[PDB]
Design a protein around this ligand. Sequence first.
Ligand code: CLA
Ligand code: II0
Ligand code: IHT
Ligand code: LMU
Lengths: 168, 180, 160, 180, 35, 42
Amino acid sequence: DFSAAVPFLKRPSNLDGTLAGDVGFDPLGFSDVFDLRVLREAELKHGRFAMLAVLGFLVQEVYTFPFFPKMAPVDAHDYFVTQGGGSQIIFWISFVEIFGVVALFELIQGKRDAGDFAFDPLGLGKDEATLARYKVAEIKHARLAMIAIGGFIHQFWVTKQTVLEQLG
Amino acid sequence: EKSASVPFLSKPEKLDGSMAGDVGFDPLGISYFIDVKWLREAELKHGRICMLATAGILVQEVIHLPGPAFSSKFALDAWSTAPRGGMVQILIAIGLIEMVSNRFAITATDMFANPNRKPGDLGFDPLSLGANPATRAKYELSEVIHGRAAMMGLSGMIHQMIVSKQPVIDQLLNFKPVDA
Amino acid sequence: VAGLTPCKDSKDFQRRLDGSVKKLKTRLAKYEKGTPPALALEKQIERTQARFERYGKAGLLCGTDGLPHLITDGRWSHSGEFVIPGLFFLYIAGWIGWVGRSYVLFARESDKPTEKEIILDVPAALSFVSTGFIWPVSAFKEFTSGNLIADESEITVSPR
Amino acid sequence: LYKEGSLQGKGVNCIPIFKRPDSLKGDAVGDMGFDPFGFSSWVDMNYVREAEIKHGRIAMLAFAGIVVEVLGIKAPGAGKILGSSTDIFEIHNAAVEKGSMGQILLWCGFFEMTAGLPAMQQMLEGSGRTPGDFGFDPLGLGKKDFAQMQIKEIQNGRLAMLAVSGMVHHALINGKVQGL
Amino acid sequence: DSMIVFENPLGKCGAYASSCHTFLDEMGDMLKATP
Amino acid sequence: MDSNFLKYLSTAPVLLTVWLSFTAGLVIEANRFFPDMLYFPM
Ligand code: CLA
Ligand SMILES: CC1=C(C#C/C(C)=C/C=C/C(C)=C/C=C/C=C(C)/C=C/C=C(\C)C#CC2=C(C)C[C@@H](O)CC2(C)C)C(C)(C)C[C@H](O)C1
Ligand SMILES: CC1=C(C#C/C(C)=C/C=C/C(C)=C/C=C/C=C(C)/C=C/C=C(C)/C=C/C2=C(C)CCCC2(C)C)C(C)(C)C[C@H](O)C1
Ligand SMILES: CCCCCCCCCCCCO[C@H]1O[C@H](CO)[C@@H](O[C@H]2O[C@H](CO)[C@@H](O)[C@H](O)[C@H]2O)[C@H](O)[C@H]1O
């Protein structure tokens, strides 16, 4: 059994392809010693944060609220740390993560699917076929955004230029 | 199998939906280890006290009893300016009220000893408005929701008063965003 | 006044305050203004001054040594020195003891009392902790109902 | 339903881009198979229908009022008290200052509390009242074709909602409700 | 001599576009602000 | 949470440590906000 992603690497035993975006990639065997459901929850939380971070970077570059000083996305971090808004965002993320802890415990108990918080306000995932396609799309975009946000931040640190400015 | 309020979390087992305001909201599972009767009695007491607290904070800013001691639009300042002997009298009266209304059963071990004792039912219905079965359920739900809303409102009022240092109505009419 | 002088008007107390403040100021003179050490020493000076002023106004009596002395005889003019503090203690301690005894009995009437005493039943323990707020009337009720004091013929005793 | 199956009802999709949700059963007037977000699954259909009718009626009245204000038609004596400004926002502020809008608010709220809230509550408790029905047909124009009138009212109200929103934002940009 | 005291909270304030700077006024100013 | 982990947290030393840490914090904060209280104020 070799991995579909890496022909020369054996397919990880825990990775049977059931989860979305499972191409058999786990060279370092974290799935062998850690719960794949917990790892998947971590993956989707990371990816959702990263996708929202990419969109936030772009929207902050083009537009900034009239009542907030205009600044590059990275500098806004240190600005709001002193201002107090960052404290509020952190506190409310922590408030949601308190219930995230209960969700994680239920996931360990098997009552929930990793990354499945039953959040479909607009009812876009009602039909299965579209739901599976959307799940593959979500994991793919999550990984791509996780790469892209690091790219954005590091490129800003190097060039001291926002990404939209840099692309020209 | 899943809670109505928080879909991804499972329904709290001890919350069977009999109680008014039950939407399956117990993410931390207090009901598992604490009797829901005690929890509901506590909830109703908190909500009632906060209903009265919100009403008082809003009303005693516009209407006061005669006297310099009672003349304070700011509620936290009223706490100090009102006669201390009167405040201690109120405390003693609240204690006697708790004792008699709970009929000497004021502890976690004896509060609900009588099967007739129901959570939050202290025998208080002076005008007998709750004797109508048709409206009793609606009144119970209204009381629970009012207690919850008033609890949140009182907490917000107290802390916004700490910040602004002005009454609630005065703050809303002369708002000044926080600066340090 | 009992046998000493009020501390608000004692040269010894004033001298002690002066000495403390001067020590702090000498320690402060070697630190730049606005640096964390300077701010810390300034706050120490403020705390010392506030403590001495509050002790002076409290009505505490001070001896020739310049230190406040306590009159723990029963005098109501000095109740806050021993009696009211001691009433708060007795309240808290009776609370602790009453709830502990209640939990001991609760574990006694259990499947495994020893398991309940090493691995606790914290819901019931918190129940008792809550009950402990009227421990005086509860304890007297136990006494008068006879559930507190055991009979002489029901307690083990060694041979004479 | 008037023209059921052609104008409204099951199998009607005003915008074939989005699929007619199964929740839309064609039982409600104005059902043209538009609900891409599938709110009909969870919402209370009668409540939301009454909300739609209320929004449409207010929007229609608002369109008439804004058009008269911009055209400059004023009641005898209105100009002296409020002013001669044609701008809708200036008129709103002037009327609030004088007290006109306050009285309109008071009486609209009284009507809401005494008519719309009780009627809505009974309808949601299963009185069988048609959404948006208050019996207000003094001139008897709806006796002939009540269903046709109902559909016409709903569609005219939707169009008026969109038009009023557009007019307000046009006034914001150019200073003209037309926005031409 | 000893009478309930009624103090008018509104004074001369208005919810919007008034001499008093209200919460709604703050929100409007913030939305119309210029960096 | 695992019932076995909860029983472990209910074990005597864990509860004693947590309760006494809570009490120490209570006393420390009381002395931090109301320091140098050699007497009940009367
Ligand atoms: C910050 C100050 C401070 C501190 C750190 C302590 C610390 C202590 N005190 Mg306390 N104590 C203080 C102030 C303080 N005291 C003051 C101001 C007073 C004067 C009122 C007392 C009076 C006092 C007494 C009378 C006793 C203690 C005891 C103790 C020790 C054990 C308490 C215990 O196990 O409670 C947990 C509670 C229990 C185990 C329940 C049984 C014991 C309590 C104290 C009974 C309380 C109710 C009872 C009806 C009181 C009758 C008293 C009468 C016979 C004189 C503990 C080292 C006890 C001791 O040393 O025993 C050898 C003790 O018996 N203290
Ligand atoms: C039971 C019973 C009886 C009774 C009775 C009685 C006396 C009933 C009394 C009921 C009362 C007083 C209810 C009060 C509710 C208050 C609420 C919900 C406040 C919410 C505030 C909020 C959300 C807020 C806020 C806010 C905050 C924090 C921030 C601010 O910037 C804004 C704002 C102000 C909006 C009687 C006696 C008749 C007998 C009968 O036989 C039985
Ligand atoms: C420090 C700091 C901040 C911060 C911050 C933040 C948010 C920092 C975030 C840093 C991040 C997100 C870094 C990501 C790096 C990703 C890498 C190297 C991916 C490599 C992927 C590879 C090689 C994939 C390879 C691929 C694989 C495996 C398989 C497919 C094929 C192939 C293409 C080969 C701020 C902004 C708040 C400022 C504040 O002052 C403090
Ligand atoms: C009616 C008969 C009932 C008998 C039972 C009474 C038992 C216990 C009574 C305790 C004494 C009353 O307590 C009292 O002490 C306070 C001391 O600050 C007083 O405080 C105030 O009282 C007076 C106004 O009412 C003022 O003139 C005082 O200057 C002021 O100190 C209050 O008047 C009351 O709170």
